[PDB]
Structure formats: structure tokens, C-alpha cells
Design a protein around this ligand. Structure first.
Ligand SMILES: NC(=O)c1ccc[n+]([C@@H]2O[C@H](COP(=O)([O-])OP(=O)(O)OC[C@H]3O[C@@H](n4cnc5c(N)ncnc54)[C@H](O)[C@@H]3O)[C@@H](O)[C@H]2O)c1
Ligand SMILES: NC(=O)c1ccc[n+]([C@@H]2O[C@H](COP(=O)([O-])OP(=O)(O)OC[C@H]3O[C@@H](n4cnc5c(N)ncnc54)[C@H](O)[C@@H]3O)[C@@H](O)[C@H]2O)c1
Ligand SMILES: NC(=O)c1ccc[n+]([C@@H]2O[C@H](COP(=O)([O-])OP(=O)(O)OC[C@H]3O[C@@H](n4cnc5c(N)ncnc54)[C@H](O)[C@@H]3O)[C@@H](O)[C@H]2O)c1
Ligand SMILES: NC(=O)c1ccc[n+]([C@@H]2O[C@H](COP(=O)([O-])OP(=O)(O)OC[C@H]3O[C@@H](n4cnc5c(N)ncnc54)[C@H](O)[C@@H]3O)[C@@H](O)[C@H]2O)c1
Lengths: 257, 253, 255, 253
């Protein structure tokens, strides 16, 4: 129960209490991963549900923006599981206030950059330190970062959100190179329009946009769509595809005229 | 009717296409192998992987023959669930663009781009008319990192593969409502007969760090990726491009 | 012996549309002009001569690659050298419709002109440029592709493919010509008011008015000409390999 | 009503920003120059070109000072026609990503990305409040090929520049109806203070052909490009990115 040769691979999913992160966690548990979930607060019903899929599941309280606590969080994961095979950088937030770029406030820019970009980058640094020190490597290893189609499609009413995600796109490319000899597959997943709490406030507009054809596959994405994709990348069949970006968007980001 | 999904793999007799065929067989697909060259010994070996396999002789460039080939695949299997556009050829000559000959440009374009486009058309006609759709469906097109990394000594090849990149995007839109996942796979430096003549120069480059993973790609690397996409988990990712290159195409300074 | 005193631009498909807007802009900047096209418009040539330089017409089918060497030699005989090549000649898809109905012969027609023809015409011109004994002016090759290189239209994939092939060609051409200090650029027009767009004016009208084009207007041939003339003047030599979108923002990916 | 257009060039006391300022002055612009520390001499160098030149002390990272800086510019010149976002800094330390310090990440992000974004915000407010628009208007942002080419030993620098790429795209949409051309310029390897400590590595790479044009870039190369875009001929190309790199960022195999 301390220092836990492991029989199952270990995925660390940030922001895994709900939404896309929970869909990812369910998919990884179904493919046979033990789960270390982080989030700002716990949901005991969630942990129970995930435990009903047959694997080991533990929750770790963490503010992704609090970079000074990341090393301790990674220590807690290692003490509970012995190693980390898959990191899913999922936790993130939308813009504090959508509106004219001329009204964008620096405090709001800072909040979202601190979480989505700065927090993700140094949480990844803390985990990679542990992965590179792993004495044994018996499972495929991956780092999957949930960015957004907003990395490559701009929304002028929330340029702080777009900038933070585009920064992740750049970070993934460099991280892939840094981890290539360690045989850690490094991938970017760009969700489009997914049914979660982050899109609930804009749900009516996105409804009509989806009926109008904005999304070529003409439906909302589900957290289980992103989860199936992430679990596919974490299984090891895509190791030689390190550096690839996957668009989990039903074709939304296909440029068309 | 059919109880196992059917993959049609062009150029599936050897190299990357054979790696893809093996990986799809392990994933539970029956196999329609097409190629302009026959090798029944390879077909026999594929049958050892547990599924049904049939071979169809086809020249990818001979677009007037594609309809009959697709009809023959339908006759044998009743339907097509996955198309892998793998058949292709390298440049006839490598050398100064100033010496590029239009006949050699034509040979490569007729196979890699024109042939792939209209062979895909013939298969899509069949897929859109499927009575039953019981398995995930996909069209996976093997282009190359040469779609996005230029080689001035073989611009005809690079152009043919860049054309495939554009075709894939439009095809994904056309087939989105039919729920056929449409993907591009860009192999980097893979150990096949296509790289055989330059195998010593690439051996040197791979060691020197040109490929961040510092190894040859294998047909089985591309096969595992293609089989991952064909299983259905990536349907909502239609239009995606996957680099099967150990990091080769990551732009770095 | 005394080399030419004005730079020479060869503009393919320069009889009308974007090619003519490019020709007018280059003539105003002091370029002599070698215009190629399938048919001549003598009134156009006279109009271009009104700007004060030498203008000469050369009948050429861009798809007829066996004739390109003779065309280039005829330009050299008349002008002594080529400083700027504008690859502008091109055609729209023969028929817009479902990809399932696309015909190989129509695919070939578009590919033979837009892609194959452009590539080997460029090859013929580059042979001449690399043999030039004197280089007194900035040199460039500017290729008019399209936003369709990077924005797909499933009802005319042959056209998109032909232009996406040009994008790849321009990147390798820029590498081949970097030591010769020939600036190689791609220009991607968006929706421009020419005979190529006249049949779909109604649909583009509404897209434009609705802000699909962020600048909310049709492009004109003079918009592309101003951009091309800017590139041909030499200030962009160190930007070789760059692509310019002449589209009022159309191709900015937005959500 | 002012009779010459006014360009505001950040970080314009040396290097690329000074080359841009020189190029704009030669094209008939008056110049408002900023930099962190005072400079009495750059005015006299630029004044030889015949226009009006003024220097303004401004820390680009100090967003609360930006409003006063812009007002000081308006007081001296009446309006701003062209903004060149040139000020920036390289990574505080190069080294393994594993050792990247958050404080150094913050310093570079505060200047290159956050500072640029909110200084543009302040300047744009002035431009949209203009009574008179007699000259072509533009905003040219100097990012880097590091926006699109990764350097794992300085990922903070790359991320800050990639953020600018996204910013410029959204800014171009925001200003499209105001007829303000919005452009990104990506320098490659330019001979300035910023490359001085790695000039030996870059000499070997440049001579080896990493840069296809096989020479160092100079401040006047970027300046000629930026002045080209500021002249109005590229207004219908708003949103375009120009690579000022001698072909460095052309992806090649
Ligand atoms: N939902 C979409 O349509 C969509 C589209 C593109 C990208 N994304 C990205 O997907 C990811 C998941 O978002 P979602 O849609 O599931 O939203 P969500 O709000 O439903 O779930 C996000 C989870 O992350 C947690 N989280 C947020 N900030 C955190 C912090 N500072 N520390 C720790 N945990 C934190 C939240 O508490 C929550 O449990 C985000 O990165 C988001 O930007 C979502
Ligand atoms: N090997 C690499 O490093 C590499 C890299 C990037 C892309 N690719 C692409 O991968 C694909 C497979 O190539 P490979 O490396 O396995 O080479 P390969 O030559 O070993 O195999 C190609 C197969 O396709 C068949 N084929 C060729 N021309 C054909 C035609 N006209 N009609 C029908 N079948 C035809 C051949 O008979 C052979 O069985 C090609 O599209 C190639 O361009 C290869
Ligand atoms: N109009 C637009 O909105 C738009 C957008 C993007 C790209 N383009 C491209 O701009 C270029 C110019 O087109 P345009 O809009 O001016 O159309 P256009 O039809 O008005 O003019 C094209 C000119 O090229 C000539 N030409 C065509 N095929 C030729 C051939 N085989 N050989 C020689 N000359 C030939 C024609 O005779 C004509 O004079 C083309 O490459 C086109 O694809 C146009
Ligand atoms: N030199 C290259 O090879 C290269 C390549 C790509 C991009 N760039 C970019 O070009 C721009 C100019 O850099 P350079 O090469 O001329 O280097 P430089 O150091 O010589 O010039 C940058 C100037 O900006 C000033 N500056 C820095 N931080 C500032 C701040 N907070 N507020 C105000 N002024 C500030 C510096 O004092 C200096 O005068 C930078 O954005 C740099 O990132 C340079």
C-alpha cells in the first residue's frame, strides 16, 4: 500500500471529476488502467462509479495553477501506485468573460493562462521527472494533452482562451521531441463542441449551429468520444506517431469553402 | 450477413501494405488484398492469421478497371467496411528539378494521386449503397511526410502526396454524414523495398538524429496505427492526419 | 554589352482577370511585360503599352508542355532576360458537383493546366533564369494558387487538389532557388471578381455580405496585383517560401 | 491634420526594431520609438532620414503604464497609423525543459505575449477612436519562426511566440472592418544581440545550409519586409504570416 511491480498500467487524469476528463477516465479504466484522478474538489459518487469498472481508483486534490504543489501531488501518486504510465492533461477552464477584445481584462487573462497553459506545463514537468526516473517500464507510456480546436480556430470574443490553447499546441511539439528517446508517446487532442458543463451556457446557440451544419457529422461530441480516442492513443499502438494532433470534433476544424 | 468486417488494402502484398494487412487481420478483419503483382505465398501466410483472405489483381493507375475490381470484392465479401489506400510508388528518378521529365511526373501522378482518387471513388460508390452497416467504417489513406516536407530532388513525388492530403480533407466532409471515418497517415522513414536502394544513407541519417526516435519505422508500426483507426474509436476524429514517423515531421530549430 | 534597363515580368494568363490586374500593377511599377495566354486581346496589349514600357504577347497553352521551351526562348529573344515570373494562368473545375460524379477526363484537364502545366512552364523559365549572365534587378517567381489549396470544396476536389499540389511545388522551388537569390512566393486569392467567379456570384454575394469574408467585400484583380507587385520589387527576397493570402481574411480559421 | 503617417515601433533602439524604424522612416513615416531604458542617441541617428522622431520610455510588460505611453504618443504625433510589435526577449536560461523555472517562464511570457497583447489593446483603442484616417493603417507583430519550429531547450520562448500567432489571427478578424491590415512577421536567424551568444552555432548551421539562402539575416531584411506591409499594398492580405528567414522554416526532407 506504499511504493505500489504493478500488474496494470497507471493513468493520471487531471480534471477527471466530470466532463471530458471523466469520460477519459472511464475509457481508460475499461481498457484496464488503474486511475489517479485529480481535481479541485472530489465527487465520491464519481470515484465509486469508476471503481465499479474493476480497477484501482484514487483521488488527489490539486489546483493545476498551484505549481508549487505539483511535486507533492506526483509524490502522492507514486506512493499510491508505484509509477505513472499515462498522463492526460485534461483540466482547464473557459474564458472568465466573453466579450470584445478591447474589454479583455489582464486579471482574467492571467487566471486562464495560469490554469490552462502555465499550470499544464509545470504539472507535466513534475510528472515527466517521475517518468524519466522510472526504474521499470513494462507498459506503453504516453502524455495526452487536451487542448481545443481553439488552438487553430480563433474566436475574437475570447482570445485569452485561444492563446492559452495555442500555447499548448506549441508545448506538445517540444515535449514530443524531449521524450522521443524515452519512448513516451506525446499527443495533442483537440475537442470541438462537446456536451459538458463548459458548453452548457452556450448550449442553445451551439444547438442551432449544429442543426445548421457547422459540425459535418451533425451531432454534439460526447465525453466518451474523446475518451475512446485518448484510450486508443494510450494503448501503445501510436508510439511511432508521437507528435501527432487528433481533432476530436466531428470534422469541425476541417477548413472548407 | 457478414459476421466479420472487411478491409480492402491496396498494395497489400508487401511492405507497409502487408504490415497493415497483418494488423487488421489480428484485429478481426477479413482481407481483400489488391496489387498489380501477385504473390499467393503472401496470401497463404495472411490466411494463417485466422480470417478470410482474397486477392484481386489491380493496377491502381488503370482507372477504367476499378469498377470491376470493386464489384469482384463485393462478390467475394458482400461489403467493404475499411479501405486502406496504400499502393504507391517512389519517384522514377531522383535529381535536379531542372531535369525532371514530364513522363516520369505522369507515371507517379497517375498511380499515387489520380489512381488513388478514382479507386477511392469506386469504393465509396459501393459503401454509400451498403444495405447493412454493422461495423465501424473508415477510409485510411497512406500519404507520406513528403506531403508536408519538401524534397527538391523528387518534387513530383512530393506533389503527388500533397495532393492526397487535400483529397483526404474533402473526402472526410463528403462522408461525414455516412459516418465513415476518413484519415490520413503520413509514414516517415519505413523499412521497405521503397527505401531499400537508399537504406545505407537513411541508416546513417536515423543514427544522426534526423528521426527523434532514432530508429527505422517498420511496416508493423504503420499497421498498428492504421488498425487503431479502423476499429471505430476515432470516428469523431474524422479528417485527422496521423504522423507515422517517430517524430520526423516535428518542425524543430 | 549593355544589359536591359527595365526589369522584365512574364505573366501567364495575362489577358484578363487577375493576370491582367497583375500586369497593370507591374507595368505601373516600371516592368516590361511578356504576356502569355491562349488567345490575345490586342486592345489589352495596347492599353498596357499606354503605361510606357515594352509589352509583347506570346500565344501559349500552359497545358502543352512540349511548347514551353519555344515560348521561353521567344521571350528571351524579345526581352533578353526574365526577372519575374507570375504563374497566374489557371482554370476552374469543368463541372461543380458530387465527387461521386467526378470524371477522370475533367480531372485531367484541370490538373494538366493548373498543376502539370505550371510546373513545367516554371521549369522552362528557371532554366533561363539560372543561365542569365547579368542579374541587375531583384528576381522572383510568384505563383497564384488559391485559398482552395488549404480550404476544401468537396464539389470541386480536382481543382483543390491541383492548387494544393502548387503549394507543395512552391516550397521545393523556393529551396532550389535560394542560392540564386530568386524570391519564390505563393499568393492565395480568396473570392475575386473575375469571369471565373461570375457564375456563382449570387452565392458568394451572400457569403461575403454575411461576413464569411471578414473584410466584407469582393476582392478585385487590382488587390492581387498590388500584392504581387509588392513581392516582385525585391523587398521580400529574405521571405522566400512565404505564402500570402489575398482574400480579405477569408482563410483565417474562425469559430 | 498630420501630413505624414506615424509608426509606433516597440523596442526600436537597436537590432530588428531599429532596422524597421529606419525602413519606415525611409518610406516617409514619422517614428515613435519605445524601449525599456532611456536613449538620447537613437533619435539623432534616425533624424538623418528627414522625418520626425520621438523616444518613449516603456516597459512592455508593465501593462498599467501602457495607457500613459499611448497618450504621450498621441500628444506628440496626433495619431498612430502603424504599430510594430517588435519588443521581446529570449529565454532567460536555455537548458533542459526539466529545469525550466516558472519565474523565468513568467518573465518571458510577461514581455513577449501578455505585454504585447495589452499594448496592442491600448494602441487599438486609440486607432478606433481616430477622427481622421488619411493613411493606410496596419499592425505588424514580430513573432518568430519559433512560433512554428520548436526548440526544446527554450520552450517558454516558443510558447510565448506561438501565443502571438494565435493572437494575430483573432486581431485580424477584430480589425477587418476598420481596414487595419494585421500581419505576422516571423524572423529566422537575424544578426542581433539576441543571437550573439549562439552566433558560433548559427554560423556552422548557416554555412551548412540550414538556412537555404546561406547567410545571416539582418535587421534591414526584416525592416524592408515590415515597411512593405505598412504601405497599404497588402490590406487585402490581412491575417497573412510572412517568414523573414531566408527559407529556414521551409519544411524539408
Ligand atoms: N467541452 C468542450 O466542448 C471542449 C472543447 C474544447 C476543449 N475542451 C477542453 O477539455 C477540457 C475539459 O473540459 P470540460 O469540457 O470537461 O469542462 P468541465 O468544466 O466540465 O470539466 C473540467 C474539469 O477540470 C477541473 N479543473 C478546472 N480547473 C482546474 C484546476 N485549476 N485545477 C484542477 N482541476 C481543475 C474542473 O473542476 C472539472 O472537474 C478542458 O481543458 C477544456 O478546455 C473542452
Ligand atoms: N517506405 C517508406 O518509407 C514510406 C514513407 C512514406 C510513405 N510511404 C508510402 O507507403 C505506401 C506503401 O509503400 P511501401 O514503402 O510499402 O513500398 P513497396 O514498394 O514495398 O510496396 C508498394 C506495394 O504497392 C504495390 N503497387 C505499386 N504500384 C502499384 C500500382 N500501380 N497498382 C497496384 N499496386 C501497386 C506494389 O506492388 C507493392 O506490393 C506508398 O504509398 C508509399 O508512397 C512509404
Ligand atoms: N477569381 C478568383 O476568385 C480566384 C481565386 C483563387 C485563385 N484564382 C486563380 O487566379 C488565376 C487567374 O484566374 P481568374 O480569376 O483571373 O480567371 P480568368 O478566367 O478570368 O482568367 C484566367 C486567364 O488565364 C488564361 N488561361 C487559362 N487557361 C490557360 C491555358 N491552358 N493556357 C494559357 N492561358 C490560360 C485564360 O485565357 C484567362 O485569360 C487562376 O490561376 C485561378 O485559379 C482565382
Ligand atoms: N534576432 C533574431 O534572430 C530573432 C528571430 C526571431 C524573432 N526575433 C524577435 O525580434 C524582436 C527584436 O529582437 P532583436 O533580435 O532585435 O533583439 P534585441 O535584444 O537586439 O532587440 C530587442 C529590443 O527590445 C527591447 N525590449 C526588450 N524587452 C522590452 C520591454 N519589456 N519593453 C520594452 N523594450 C523591450 C530591448 O531592450 C531591445 O532594444 C524580438 O521580438 C525577438 O524575439 C528575433
Amino acid at each position: 500500500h506504499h511504493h505500489h511491480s504493478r500488474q496494470r498500467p497507471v493513468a493520471l487524469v487531471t480534471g477527471g471529476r466530470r466532463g471530458i476528463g471523466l469520460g477519459i477516465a472511464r475509457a481508460l479504466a475499461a481498457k484496464g488502467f488503474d486511475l489517479a484522478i485529480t481535481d479541485r474538489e472530489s465527487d465520491e459518487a464519481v470515484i465509486h462509479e469508476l471503481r465499479g469498472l474493476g480497477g484501482k481508483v484514487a483521488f488527489f486534490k490539486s489546483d493545476l495553477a498551484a505549481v508549487k504543489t505539483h511535486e507533492a501531488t506526483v509524490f502522492a501518486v507514486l506512493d499510491a501506485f508505484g509509477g505513472i504510465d499515462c498522463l492526460v492533461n485534461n483540466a482547464g477552464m473557459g474564458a472568465v468573460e466573453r466579450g470584445d477584445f478591447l474589454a479583455l481584462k489582464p486579471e482574467n487573462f492571467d487566471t486562464i493562462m495560469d490554469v490552462n497553459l502555465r499550470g499544464t506545463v509545470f504539472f507535466t514537468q513534475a510528472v515527466v521527472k517521475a517518468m524519466l526516473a522510472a526504474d521499470e517500464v513494462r507498459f506503453p507510456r504516453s502524455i495526452v494533452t487536451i487542448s481545443s480546436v481553439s488552438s487553430v480556430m480563433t474566436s475574437p470574443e475570447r482570445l485569452d482562451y485561444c492563446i492559452s490553447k495555442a500555447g499548448l499546441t506549441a508545448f506538445v511539439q517540444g515535449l514530443a521531441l524531449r521524450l522521443a528517446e524515452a519512448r513516451i508517446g506525446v499527443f495533442e487532442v483537440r475537442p470541438g463542441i462537446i456536451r459538458t458543463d463548459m458548453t452548457a451556457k452556450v448550449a442553445a446557440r451551439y444547438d442551432a449551429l449544429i442543426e445548421g451544419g457547422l459540425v459535418p457529422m451533425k451531432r454534439w461530441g460526447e465525453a466518451s468520444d474523446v475518451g475512446a480516442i485518448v484510450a486508443g492513443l494510450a494503448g501503445g499502438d501510436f508510439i511511432f506517431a508521437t507528435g501527432s494532433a487528433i481533432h476530436a470534433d466531428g470534422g469541425l476544424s476541417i477548413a472548407k469553402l
